[PDB]
UniProtKB/Swiss-Prot annotation, chain B:
The keyword Transmembrane helix applies. This is Immunoglobulin heavy constant mu. The basic structural unit of both sIgM and mIgM molecules consists of two identical heavy chains and two identical light chains; disulfide-linked. N-terminal variable regions of the heavy and light chains form the antigen binding sites, whereas the C-terminal constant regions of the heavy chains interact with immune receptors to mediate effector functions. N-glycosylated; important for IgM secretion and its localization at the plasma membrane. The interaction with FCMR is glycan-independent. Residues 103-210 are annotated as: CH4. Constant region of immunoglobulin heavy chains. Immunoglobulins, also known as antibodies, are membrane-bound or secreted glycoproteins produced by B lymphocytes. In the recognition phase of humoral immunity, the membrane-bound immunoglobulins serve as receptors which, upon binding of a specific antigen, trigger the clonal expansion and differentiation of B lymphocytes into immunoglobulins-secreting plasma cells. Secreted immunoglobulins mediate the effector phase of humoral immunity, which results in the elimination of bound antigens.
Amino acid sequence: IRVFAIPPSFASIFLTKSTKLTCLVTDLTTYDSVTISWTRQNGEAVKTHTNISESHPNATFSAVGEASICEDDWNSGERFTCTVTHTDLPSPLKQTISRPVALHRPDVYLLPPAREQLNLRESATITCLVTGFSPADVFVQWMQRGQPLSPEKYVTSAPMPEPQAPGRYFAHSILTVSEEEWNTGETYTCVVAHEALPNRVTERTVDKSTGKPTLYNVSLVMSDTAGTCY
Amino acid sequence: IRVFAIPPSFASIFLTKSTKLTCLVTDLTTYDSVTISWTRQNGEAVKTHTNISESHPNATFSAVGEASICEDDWNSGERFTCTVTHTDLPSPLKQTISRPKGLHRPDVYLLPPAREQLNLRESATITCLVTGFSPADVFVQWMQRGQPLSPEKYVTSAPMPEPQAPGRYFAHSILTVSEEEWNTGETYTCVVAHEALPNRVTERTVDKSTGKPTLYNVSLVMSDTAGTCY
Amino acid sequence: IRVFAIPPSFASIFLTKSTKLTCLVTDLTTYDSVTISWTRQNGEAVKTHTNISESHPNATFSAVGEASICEDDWNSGERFTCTVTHTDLPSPLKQTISRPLHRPDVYLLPPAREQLNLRESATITCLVTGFSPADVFVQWMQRGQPLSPEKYVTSAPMPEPQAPGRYFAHSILTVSEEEWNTGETYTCVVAHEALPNRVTERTVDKSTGKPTLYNVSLVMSDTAGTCY
């Protein structure tokens, strides 16, 4: 006999360009004549729900209230309530979405695979370490010459609360590039989506030759006439 | 009595992040108690423009006002109208302008100063060429220690038409840095802004080491037996 | 009413050493009997300003002086006062133009390595730095042979960021990156007035630039002091 409330979040924001306000109906059996709609801080007209669904297989019903709004509507820090009057509860039922803060910029890093991995010659793993930032909800994606990989290609964490840097979060991601598939160039840019940056985004990349710093074979010779000039 | 009217444009709506409608009313008869409005095509109670401009002191008239929108509005492509009349003119200065739909993705290259500049001992100049992009309207900013430099430190071009491939543009920017500072560290990466990047932002970087390891092959010979060759 | 006078430009001056000045008259009354007469600072007449022009597309007869003078006769502030009398002007309208420093610095950056992986566009950059004054002309030379003027694209001398008043401009040019195997160093010929011979050519090729394979080879001996 409750209604969850779904505010927009940067996963939906960035990954869709379709800032989203949502609250669905759960915990209640197969129902109709129920109304779902959205209201603002000052409570005015929105686009109505779509995506009608069946009943859940556990003796309850499924239906979702959805629409799209302007981004600054959330970014201006306002209350947003979806208004519903249940058939079992003629009294008003209200669920609210809103945003609160200090901020910290991520400094995305990147470490090439361990040489130990590059001795069985099957797979190489890359660690798009992300850290030192606030607030949370960082999405991260991996470019490859302007081509985003699928999120299924790689894996990532959730924002783990940072032990030392107090009000800060961090996460990770990995991807199992195979041996030759790292051994041929293919810089694999790693791009980070957050809100603590001037243009809100950053990206970094690596290859074999991120280091390799000036290897150079000195040679000293005497007493060995080679029959060649100098 | 021409009236300026700037449509929203990316170099602004990213610099600003505050997409807005701005009709500059000039060359109209120099009066006050003017009648000025900003509207949509169907022209609802559209937010008229606040922060009007004062009279032009040079025996001309000057007036302008910003009207904020949501960017997806301009994305729809339907026109937006600055409806302005005068005490003299009953017919409003109807302002029906829309960017036409349809576009090429750039690909930045950052260029390091050749050795010549460095030997001069004073200053080093770095350039990231921007190419291949259509349409126009690209911002370019250069970014260092994760903080934005300021425009007076680096000059920037204006969007130019390319010579060969018709539907393409290109541009430039120029940085002036002291020599040692480029023998010191910081990367001097560059950020751009274009409406066809998948992330709508891309970035490159350099440094003294951005080249290649440069294998030495010193071969000090100190015998007195093998000879040289003319 | 638009009557502007064109001072000479070091482009044409470099072209044929033929400093020229024109004060064209446009959008005046549509009548024939248009006279062109230029004067030095003594007021004396000028050379063969000729080649009459027809009415403009906006239906106004077009005329312009064709005044050749000496390069030396330009360097002391000679208000080149040109008069044109016309039917509409019992008071003919006069026009004048006259003569109103820092060394340039030219470099030629090669393309980018990542440019040289797309495998079509071989960009090349010539350049000029911190000079006064403007009006400088630039062009690119390939084996004593000037390139296609459209092949490159020229900037204009926008002012310096931090210098007091100096100027700088640019120019860029593309070729097949397959060509960036013969190279031929694509000499960019700057052309500025404030040069000892008014040209400070510089050029760059693949073999130029930076190698990443040295092999220094010092030798050491008493059998020296000679430099064969």
